[PDB]
Ligand binder design. Sequence first.
Ligand code: 5CU
Ligand code: 5CU
Ligand code: ZN
Ligand code: ZN
Lengths: 369, 368
Amino acid sequence: PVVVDIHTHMYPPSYIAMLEKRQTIPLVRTFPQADEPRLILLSSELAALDAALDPAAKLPGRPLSTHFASLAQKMHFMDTNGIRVSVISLANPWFDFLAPDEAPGIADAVNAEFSDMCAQHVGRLFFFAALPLSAPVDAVKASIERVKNLKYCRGIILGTSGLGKGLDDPHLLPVFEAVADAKLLVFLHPHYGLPNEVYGPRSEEYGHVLPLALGFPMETTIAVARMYMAGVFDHVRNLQMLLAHSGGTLPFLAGRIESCIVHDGHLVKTGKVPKDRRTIWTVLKEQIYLDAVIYSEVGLQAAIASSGADRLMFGTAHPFFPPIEEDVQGPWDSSRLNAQAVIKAVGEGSSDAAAVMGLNAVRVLSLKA
Amino acid sequence: PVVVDIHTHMYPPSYIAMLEKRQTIPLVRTFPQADEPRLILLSSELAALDAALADPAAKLPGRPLSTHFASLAQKMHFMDTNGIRVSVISLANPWFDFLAPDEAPGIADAVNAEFSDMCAQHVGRLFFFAALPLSAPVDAVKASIERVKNLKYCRGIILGTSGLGKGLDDPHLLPVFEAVADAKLLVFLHPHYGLPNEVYGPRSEEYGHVLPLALGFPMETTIAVARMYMAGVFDHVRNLQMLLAHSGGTLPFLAGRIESCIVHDGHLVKTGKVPKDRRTIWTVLKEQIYLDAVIYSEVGLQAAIASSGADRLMFGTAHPFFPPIEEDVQGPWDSSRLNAQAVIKAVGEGSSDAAAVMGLNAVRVLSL
Ligand SMILES: O=C(O)c1c[nH]c(=O)[nH]c1=O
Ligand SMILES: O=C(O)c1c[nH]c(=O)[nH]c1=O
Ligand SMILES: [Zn+2]
Ligand SMILES: [Zn+2]
């Protein structure tokens, strides 16, 4: 049985060294009272960083294990968790924070690193590239041309900020067109979350649960809905999009979105809701793929009902949710839960199981050579 | 056999009279080019309101205040023509949240008694959720709860996500939840405040009400409940029962992710906050949470049913917020019919589960 993981990240050592030299988010710090460094990515982690410098105050961020930067460690995880092929991607926030002039050069270097990592285990590793979206659109297009010509590259991973004004930014259209024409799957992934005040004044007490469990998928939903409302999928008809975490909440809210559209007085009266309009259901079946990183047959079944079994792809979200604090060199419960969600949704040994667990990814992303 | 609608709102004439006086949201305002007044409730509508006050050619702000918001005869007509036998009505958002602390108890108690009066006009076909003066001191809120407990036709409390002003995980709110639950009143949690409008980006004004209504509302509900859960409110007030607007917002879809994030949260686990015997969000969804079926899809409804059980799903319409555009409002409403069809597609017409979701659950749970 062929298992493929399309949701699995790394930070190359050069990228981590960069983060260690940074003053502002994202950054890496190393505290004396802990072994491995602290990865600090979110604005929700800022106060804990401030607080951690008594040493009895909790360590900020999350630990930067060897599973972030070691390729042997990625392969070990794959071998121990029964994964044949990984389509690896740079973790959030990618190159979003880089200065415009430096961004393309660093992106092309780091993208080439990922290609080289894939060459170490040919057949078992492909990758999503990231883009220098702080740079001019000219440079973004140039970087897109490069990753198209890098071996083992099968798509682009990107966040919700776009050029800095979201994914409904009309300046971003030529970027979507270039990627779509290059036959590169766009993997949309969260990072920026929601403004932290929505979590209220006790959010610190709940650890990372609210920003990660709610903020991330809600961010993804908002970004895709904006793309949809802006007509991006109509503009770029051959654009294909993989959505992280089974679309965030999109499968569950697709109906409410459709109802709110057709019952929007202003939009209907101003010709924004025409008779031949492609519904979000249609887009979900034609231009959107969903990963199966949803941790439940309940969510997964909604995702399957929305996009179809042939458009769902298994993922683990490695290395972000290691087991606490047991054998990290053993199987990961966070990976197992998603495999269990699939099995319970469609039945183990079913062709839908085989499709979701790897064959969809093999087919859609041409995972050969 | 009996169709019950538990998600259906009104503003009494006295409440609308308050809104017509107001400067800031919520408010009602008449513009010259429209027959119906304009109801402006949301933060996302403020830009359009300001533009319309300056520029007469700018688009009408908010939404039409139809007769279906205030008229009891229109509610009964809506019910008769959409095949609804019983409605558990409620004051619509933002309830009494906007009132000054000093004036809120008196107004809240007077309006709650008006709802009792309205229900008495059509015996057996109308019941209601009351609203609370949550801007007032907690002793005033508890006094209001004591009153609505004994109000004829009252079967629960509708409330928003703000609580006393710091959300539903506010320790100072626990006496309120305790009093409501001991009063055997069901809490109907409903959105209003949404998300900070900046999440919708610089083109937000081109998308109508879609993003705040379709995304903001359900996400707000999810965040508020998740905060209650993480704070241990459902254990601490173990007898508390909650009806969640719009099938829990997104909770059925995110319950698995929440559970995984909790058990894989380094800080929470190491600090002993995640014992193996903890009542999971699934357990709470199955024992303390009811979900309405206002989800507009069999996809969404099946997820809700799987999460809480068919015995804990209840039919609703969100009347009068999504009228047909702009055709016969006196006919059947699609926004009602869509949800009824979702139920049939999910559990099958003529089934016990269909009968349960469409009204028998509500009759049992709310003692109608
Ligand atoms: O859930 C995830 O995939 C992630 C969660 N948290 C992160 O910081 N990065 C991720 O990729
Ligand atoms: O969908 C709804 O239930 C509502 C939508 N918009 C509102 O302003 N009030 C509501 O109750
Ligand atoms: Zn991820
Ligand atoms: Zn409502």
